[PDB]
Design a protein around this ligand. Structure first.
Ligand SMILES: [Ca+2]
Length: 346
């Protein structure tokens, strides 16, 4: 593949999002800054009005996602780790309006908070995605408290579906059910760092880290249990089993679409529906942090039929993957001197 380094000097960049036409790209730096990159103008100073964050461990400023109607509204959603009571943090999601001159995020306000707050630095999740109807999906980790992913009254280890304003859609699976959070779409997730709308089927797909082994790709269905920590393809970091695990397959829990017994460290995900590189059409691209590579899965409908590895000689932790309107892939690398990369098939 071809690789062009478009920008360096990004401190642990986490998310990118394209703005319309040639207006550029927004990029988050996990320590807590939002930037705008454009091909002629380079990288902006930090944009004003961004929330303060819990910038410890894996937390900080996470996803940036312009609203589907950004051209009209200039609305920009952000996810981030937010401090709370008792010195524990949790994920939060809000939005503001990017000013006409790109200098300031105006009137930022939180619309959703993970509760309770249980993290001391790990497993925020944080990816965001809109579906075809404009509903907002939010992927949440279990804050490193493994059993809470199974608990229906806790927002740990859940995929959440909200309206554009953060309200609960009345057809969410748990609405009206005692002891269950009505924001929840699916449960039993560990630490999801991939979330994307399949452009052909209209289904949200998700991926998540396993512990020592067992990273997973899922197609999450409403009200379904993805099994963490009762079911897993991984073990604990010590080499002992995860204490709560009953098996790789556990009845009443849904299997992953695809799994990796040796964890690449999945991060970022994009379906390729461009015209520039026809050989890449109907592929799903996923970053690998630990294995420092880009994964390409060939799809036949909902089936994964082949797995390819790219960029394995570059030595960069791939944190973010987006399919650009110009037909190239755009990546961020997770390092102190983090990079924005433009990647093509040849
Ligand atoms: Ca699972």
């Amino acid at each position: 593949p071809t690789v062009s380094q478009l920008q360096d000097g990004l401190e642990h960049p986490w998310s990118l999002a394209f703005l319309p036409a040639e207006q550029g790209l927004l990029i988050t730096e996990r320590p807590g800054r939002l930037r705008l990159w454009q091909q002629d103008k380079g990288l902006s100073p930090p944009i004003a009005g961004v929330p303060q964050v819990y910038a410890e461990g894996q937390g900080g400023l996470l996803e940036v996602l312009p609203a589907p109607d950004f051209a009209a509204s200039r609305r920009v959603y952000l996810s981030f780790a937010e401090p709370g009571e008792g010195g524990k943090a949790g994920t939060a999601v809000g939005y503001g309006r990017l000013s006409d001159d790109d200098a300031r995020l105006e009137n930022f306000k939180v619309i959703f908070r993970q509760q309770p707050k249980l993290s001391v630095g790990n497993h925020f999740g944080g990816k965001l995605a809109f579906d075809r109807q404009g509903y907002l999906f939010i992927a949440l980790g279990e804050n490193n408290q493994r059993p809470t992913a199974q608990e229906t009254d806790k927002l740990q280890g859940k995929l959440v579906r909200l309206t554009a304003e953060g309200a609960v859609p009345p057809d969410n699976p748990w609405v009206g059910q005692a002891g269950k959070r009505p924001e929840v779409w699916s449960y039993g997730h560990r630490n999801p760092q991939g979330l994307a709308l399949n452009p052909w089927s209209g289904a949200i797909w998700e991926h998540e880290h396993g512990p020592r082994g067992g990273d997973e790709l899922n197609i999450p269905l409403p009200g379904k249990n993805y099994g963490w920590p009762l079911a897993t393809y991984g073990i604990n970091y010590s080499g002992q089993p995860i204490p709560e695990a009953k098996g790789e397959r556990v009845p009443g829990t849904e299997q992953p679409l695809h799994y990796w017994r040796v964890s690449p460290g999945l991060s970022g995900m994009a379906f390729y529906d461009g015209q520039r590189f026809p050989a890449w059409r109907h592929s799903l691209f996923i970053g690998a942090l630990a294995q420092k590579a880009l994964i390409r899965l060939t799809l036949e409908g909902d089936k994964v039929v082949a797995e390819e590895r790219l960029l394995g000689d570059r030595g960069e932790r791939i944190r973010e993957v987006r399919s650009g309107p110009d037909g190239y892939l755009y990546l961020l690398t997770d390092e102190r001197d983090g990079k924005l990369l433009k990647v093509g098939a040849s």
